[PDB]
Amino acid sequence: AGSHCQKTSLRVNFEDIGWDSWIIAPKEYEAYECKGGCFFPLADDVTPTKHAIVQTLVHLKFPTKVGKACCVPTKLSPISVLYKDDMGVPTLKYHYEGMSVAECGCR
Amino acid sequence: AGSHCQKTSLRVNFEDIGWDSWIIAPKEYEAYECKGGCFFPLADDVTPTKHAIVQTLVHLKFPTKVGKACCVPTKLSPISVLYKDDMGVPTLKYHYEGMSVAECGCR
């Protein structure tokens, strides 16, 4: 199937999320999103752990008692932001970690 | 709030999931499950990445276009299983990795 767990675009405006109080720049960045579902047969590039597999199997058997595996970011990349310091000096954070999806997987 | 992302019990029977074809023992093990939700204010022991935070914020603003952060296992533990080899010899896998939840978090 072609509707499995995968990286798709998500452009994030810092004002929308209340972060423009401390981020001067940029206005928007490409965060990613991980979209789709984790069901058998698994999409090939989704990594999965043995727990995710077992959980997906248990969820088929008891769909009302046990959740499914979740499609989530499993590796993240940094971006750079311009924020303000104590004297109000615009300052660059070169690698602000965990901001964009590098990889998605079932977990 | 007390309904946030956390480790709860999940006992898994290998027959239920079709794994008893290759696992002699045990019949059942404690896999865990990660239950609850990822919403603000975040539960304290949930780790979260900056992406999970940004995504949760974007989901509040656009709940129909963007998913929430997911409560998932973020660290896994091994267990031991007894399986069968080529001559049909019962063989012990001492650390079969990724079988039980050690930690949960929002991702």
Burial class (CB in 10 A: 0-12, 13-18, 19+), B83: middle
Owner of token pair 């675009």: A9
DSSP notation for chain A: ---BSEEEEEEEETTTTT-TTTEEE-SEEEEEEEESB--SSPPTTS---HHHHHHHHHHHHSTTTSPPP-EEEEEEEEEEEEEE-TT--EEEEEEEEEEEEEEEEE-
List chain A residues with CB under 8 Å of B31: 51, 54-55, 58
Q: Yes or no: say if A91 and A85 are a contact pair by the CB < 8 Å rule.
A: yes
Inter-chain CB proximity B16 and A61 less than 8 Å:
yes
| Run of H or E residues at B79 | strand B71-84
Report which secondary-structure segment, H or E, holds B98.
strand B90-106
Q: Which two tokens stand for residue A47?
A: 């990594």
Q: Does the distance separating the beta carbons of A33 and B55 come in below 8 Å?
A: yes
Radius of gyration from C-alpha coordinates of chain B = 18
Nominal resolution (angstroms):
2.3
- Residue in A35, A51, A99 closest to B31 by CB: A51
Work out the minimum CA distance from A86 to partner chain B, whole angstroms.
23
Where do we find the tokens 């720049």?
A: A25
Q: Where are the domains of chain A?
A: 1-107
- Which structural technique was applied? X-ray
List the one residue out of B11, B8, B19 whose CA is nearest residue A62. B11
* Helix, strand or coil, per DSSP, at residue B55: helix
User: Which region holds residue A99: left if phi is over 0, alpha if psi is between -120 and 50, else beta?
Assistant: alpha
Domain B1-107: CATH architecture, name and number where available = Ribbon (2.10)
> Using only C-alpha atoms, what is the Rg of chain A?
18
Taking the CA of residue A68 and the nearest CA in chain B, the distance in Å comes to 10
Q: Which residue of A has its CA nearest to B11?
A: A58
How far is A5 from B36, CA to CA, in rounded Å? 21
Contact B51 A98 (CB under 8 A): yes
Q: Residue B14 corresponds to which tokens in the numbers above? A: 């290998």
Distance CA B74, CA A59 (A): 19
| Coil, helix or strand at residue B49 | coil
Residue carrying structure tokens 């940094």 = A78
